[PDB]
Design a protein around this ligand. Sequence first.
Ligand code: NGE
Length: 308
Amino acid sequence: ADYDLKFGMNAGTSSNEYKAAEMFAKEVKEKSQGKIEISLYPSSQLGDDRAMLKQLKDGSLDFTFAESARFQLFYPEAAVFALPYVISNYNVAQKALFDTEFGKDLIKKMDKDLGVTLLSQAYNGTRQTTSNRAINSIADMKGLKLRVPNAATNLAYAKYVGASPTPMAFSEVYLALQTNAVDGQENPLAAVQAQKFYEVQKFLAMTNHILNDQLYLVSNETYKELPEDLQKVVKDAAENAAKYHTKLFVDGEKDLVTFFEKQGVKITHPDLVPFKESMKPYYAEFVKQTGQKGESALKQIEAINPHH
Ligand SMILES: O=C(CO)N[C@H]1[C@H]([C@H](O)[C@H](O)CO)O[C@](O)(C(=O)O)C[C@@H]1O
């Protein structure tokens, strides 16, 4: 095609992310009259999300996914998006990004500094904790060998609840669980399904600890080359895809209990009061490290009423 473009992702071919990206690619092909074709590169073929964000910056990859929280790699205060238990729900995640001074200035920085244009935001689920033994309370987290992604906020979740974290890439997790090299991991229900972690984890605990969004990102090097009518095709398609993406996750969160129980998984509901209390020193550390900018981001986000 005139524009043979590429969309990379960590998520695999059975995932909601991939299904929504498929929708995006199909609409862009159709509505561009075939001028743009977007091919998909799932399962970390191109590297992880850190690597793929660098590829958007350089222009060697056209589209990718990231969370708002991922930008804590560049702007430490943006860890606010993934401080456990701070963001109540997706409604808060949306307003935090688009309707705070903090969020709006982040979007502008992603463009100016990082060479990426934010097309749309979707919901990517609320992370829960799977394991090879029951988590009936916070006591069961003590010394649990808990895999985490290579992200500071997930590492801190594991540390402050009393677990023993092992960072590793998403692609490596299934084998780590299967072999019991680690005891557990944490991800939204949809990812537990998509990666088939239920095959290698007997237990799931509703820790409700971090809320993931999902940003549809384009490389400025690519977006600048598209005539403006095709830019609009791409933006409109990303917006349509994000709405579908969010629905896939919302529907799955009300539907997946039946699925996991049918697969033999035991689901627990530990008291979250001590999980939340265990985070108080982390929040203090975040404020110490990120200073006024972090205190401000937290104030702005904690001001958002969670009720639609
Ligand atoms: O790659 C992205 C893009 O948002 N998100 C990945 C996500 C992400 O890299 C982390 O939440 C850090 O922001 O990590 C996982 O949840 C995981 O490795 O458990 C996989 C998920 O696909």
